[PDB]
A paper describes a structure:
The Ras proteins are master regulators of cell proliferation and survival that transduce growth stimuli emanating from cell-surface receptors to cytoplasmic kinases responsible for orchestrating a comprehensive cell division program. Ras proteins are cytosolic, membrane-bound GTPases that bind guanine nucleotides and are regulated by their nucleotide state: guanosine triphosphate (GTP)–bound Ras adopts a conformation that binds Ras effector proteins with high affinity, leading to their activation and downstream signaling, whereas guanosine diphosphate (GDP)–bound Ras adopts a conformation that cannot bind effectors and thus is inactive. High-resolution crystal structures demonstrate that the miniproteins bind Ras as a dimer and interact via a distinct binding mode that captures the Ras effector domain in an open conformational state, which can be stabilized by insertion of a proline at Asp-38 in Ras.
Our data reveal a previously unobserved Ras binding mode wherein a miniprotein dimer disrupts the switch I loop and β-strand 2 of Ras and engages β-strands 1–3 and switch II, primarily through a single miniprotein α-helix.
Author numbering:
A (entry chain C): 2 to 32
B (entry chain B): 3 to 32
C (entry chain A): 2 to 26, 39 to 166
The structure:
Amino acid sequence: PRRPRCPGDDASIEDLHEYWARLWNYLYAVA
Amino acid sequence: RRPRCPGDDASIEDLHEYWARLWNYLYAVA
Amino acid sequence: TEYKLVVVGAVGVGKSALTIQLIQNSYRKQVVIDGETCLLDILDTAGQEEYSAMRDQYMRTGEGFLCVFAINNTKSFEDIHHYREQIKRVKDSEDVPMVLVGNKCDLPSRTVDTKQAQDLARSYGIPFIETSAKTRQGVDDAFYTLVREIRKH
Ligand SMILES: Nc1nc2c(ncn2[C@@H]2O[C@H](COP(=O)(O)OP(=O)(O)O)[C@@H](O)[C@H]2O)c(=O)[nH]1
Ligand SMILES: [Ca+2]
Ligand SMILES: [Ca+2]
Ligand SMILES: [Mg+2]
C-alpha cells in the first residue's frame, strides 16, 4: 500500500486522473 | 480552478479532503 | 464509514446550491445519521452532460445518487428518466441507491406538483423529498435519506 505522489502543476488532466485513481485505491486499502 | 497538491506530510483526512476536490474538478474539465 | 454521493440533473436546478448548503450551510462533511457517524463525499456534476470515459468512472465511484429537478422546470422533471438510465448504465445495476429530489420548493410558482413526482419515485421504488437550497429546507434530509438507501442495499 504505497502512498501516491501528487504530480506538480505541470501535470496534465490524465496525470491527475491517474493520481485520482491511485489516491482512491490508497485511501480504500488504508481504511 | 485546479486544487493544489496536499503535500508530502498531508494526513489521511487531508487526502480525503483533496480527493473530493479533485473529484469535482476532473469531472468539470472533462 | 465512507459514503460517495453524486448529484445529477438538468443545469440550473440547483445541484451546486444544494451542495453548498450541505457543506458550508469543500465537498466533504462529517455527519451523524441514525446514530451512526458518516463521512460524506459529494460529487457536484458541473457543466452539461457529454460523452466521457473518465466522467463515467467518476460516477461509477458514486454509491448514491440524487436525481435533482426543479419544481418550476418541466423539462428538468422529464429528464429524470434520462439521468436514471445513465446511472444504471454506468453502475451496471438495475437497483442503485437513489433519491428523487424536487428543488426550489420555496417558489410559489410551480409547474411540477408533488403528486406527479411522488408517483414517479413510487414507480422507481425510491424516496422523494422536496428541497429548498434558499431556505435550507429538506437539504439535509435529501442527502441523509440517500445514505439510508445505501445502507438498505
Ligand atoms: N429559489 C431558489 N432558487 C434556487 C434554489 N437552488 C438554486 N437556485 C437558483 O438557481 C441558480 C443556479 O443554480 P445552480 O446550483 O448553479 O444550478 P446547477 O448547479 O446547474 O444545478 C442560482 O442562481 C440560484 O439562485 C432553491 O432551492 N430555491
Ligand atoms: Ca468536454
Ligand atoms: Ca468528451
Ligand atoms: Mg452547478
